[PDB]
Design an enzyme around this catalytic site. Structure first.
Site, PDB file in Angstrom:
ATOM      1  N   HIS A  45       0.795  -1.216   0.000  1.00  0.00           N
ATOM      2  CA  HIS A  45       0.000   0.000   0.000  1.00  0.00           C
ATOM      3  C   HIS A  45       0.836   1.280   0.000  1.00  0.00           C
ATOM      4  O   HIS A  45       0.368   2.340  -0.398  1.00  0.00           O
ATOM      5  CB  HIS A  45      -1.082  -0.035   1.086  1.00  0.00           C
ATOM      6  CG  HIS A  45      -0.621   0.397   2.447  1.00  0.00           C
ATOM      7  ND1 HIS A  45      -0.364  -0.496   3.479  1.00  0.00           N
ATOM      8  CD2 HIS A  45      -0.369   1.632   2.947  1.00  0.00           C
ATOM      9  CE1 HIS A  45       0.007   0.182   4.561  1.00  0.00           C
ATOM     10  NE2 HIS A  45       0.014   1.478   4.258  1.00  0.00           N
ATOM     11  N   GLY A 186       2.503   6.312   8.627  1.00  0.00           N
ATOM     12  CA  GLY A 186       3.916   6.627   8.455  1.00  0.00           C
ATOM     13  C   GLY A 186       4.846   5.495   8.896  1.00  0.00           C
ATOM     14  O   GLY A 186       6.046   5.480   8.498  1.00  0.00           O
ATOM     15  N   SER A 188       3.832   2.319   8.316  1.00  0.00           N
ATOM     16  CA  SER A 188       3.515   1.282   7.315  1.00  0.00           C
ATOM     17  C   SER A 188       4.738   0.892   6.545  1.00  0.00           C
ATOM     18  O   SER A 188       5.483   1.767   6.138  1.00  0.00           O
ATOM     19  CB  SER A 188       2.524   1.831   6.302  1.00  0.00           C
ATOM     20  OG  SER A 188       1.243   2.027   6.907  1.00  0.00           O
ATOM     21  N   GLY A 189       4.887  -0.408   6.294  1.00  0.00           N
ATOM     22  CA  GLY A 189       6.005  -0.865   5.453  1.00  0.00           C
ATOM     23  C   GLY A 189       7.241  -1.217   6.252  1.00  0.00           C
ATOM     24  O   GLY A 189       8.117  -1.984   5.767  1.00  0.00           O
TER      25      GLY A 189
END
Ligand SMILES: [Ca+2]
Length: 240
Positions: A45, A186, A188-189
């Site tokens: 995403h 922020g 995420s990932g």
């Protein structure tokens, strides 16, 4: 990360900042884990938008020169082919970025250790989330890398009615849910690092929190389960 503490500069050397071009400058959008000198693991995403992205390794403070950063463009993005942007709850929130250059390793820049395929952590296993994401629901990004202690919540509990119900899949790891500490926009990932046989390994890629808020009791932060995708990751790196 809500309820975090500032990480030491050399604690989590596989954490990267994924940034996009914003006018004449660059803005942090997501985390990532450096898994090869030229490959980063992040959330699908994070890279849906048709933006220009770069990776920063050796980063600690987004708003000041740390004297350790290496900046590298993203040359190729490989999203898991079952990813559907309209359905984060379906899973497959993972992507690999091939970097334009191979980065140089040191105390601030190291490859993340990945778990063996299929590994599932026992309930309440010790993990830390790291990232520069919001420090409060509807807040602002951190300046310095933050970490928070988030124990896993196993599938039977995470998928129970008072937690995430059907939204959580076995291809995910849940962690936290204490109402105080959590991932937030922020993060995420980025990595969920979990201690197993004395060594931290990256068991999760941060994926989502509740729409109600980041630190919500019984809504632990949810991560793509890295050990569900070991074969997929090796196949991408081998064919690219
Ligand atoms: Ca910096």
């Amino acid at each position: 990360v809500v309820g975090g503490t500032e990480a030491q500069r050399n604690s989590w050397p596989s954490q990267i900042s994924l940034q996009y071009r914003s006018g004449s400058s660059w803005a942090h959008t997501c985390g990532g884990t450096l898994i090869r000198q030229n490959w980063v693991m992040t959330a699908a995403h994070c890279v849906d938008r048709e933006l220009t992205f770069r990776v920063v390794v050796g980063e600690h403070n987004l708003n000041q020169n740390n004297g350790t950063e290496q900046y590298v463009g993203v040359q190729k993005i490989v999203v898991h082919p079952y990813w559907n942007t309209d359905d984060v709850a379906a899973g497959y929130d993972i992507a690999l970025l091939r970097l334009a250059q191979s980065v140089t390793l040191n105390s601030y820049v190291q490859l993340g250790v990945l778990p063996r395929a299929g590994t599932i952590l026992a309930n309440n296993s010790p993990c830390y989330i790291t990232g520069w994401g919001l420090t409060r629901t509807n807040g602002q990004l951190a300046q310095t890398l933050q970490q928070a202690y988030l124990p896993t919540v196993d599938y039977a509990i995470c998928s129970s009615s008072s937690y995430w119900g059907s939204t959580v899949k076995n291809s995910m790891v849940c962690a936290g849910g204490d109402g105080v500490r959590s991932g937030c926009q922020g993060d995420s990932g980025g990595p969920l690092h979990c201690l197993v046989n004395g060594q931290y390994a990256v068991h999760g890629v941060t994926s989502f929190v509740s729409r109600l808020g980041c630190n919500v009791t019984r809504k632990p932060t949810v991560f793509t389960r890295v050990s569900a995708y070991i074969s997929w990751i090796n196949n991408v790196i081998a064919s690219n």
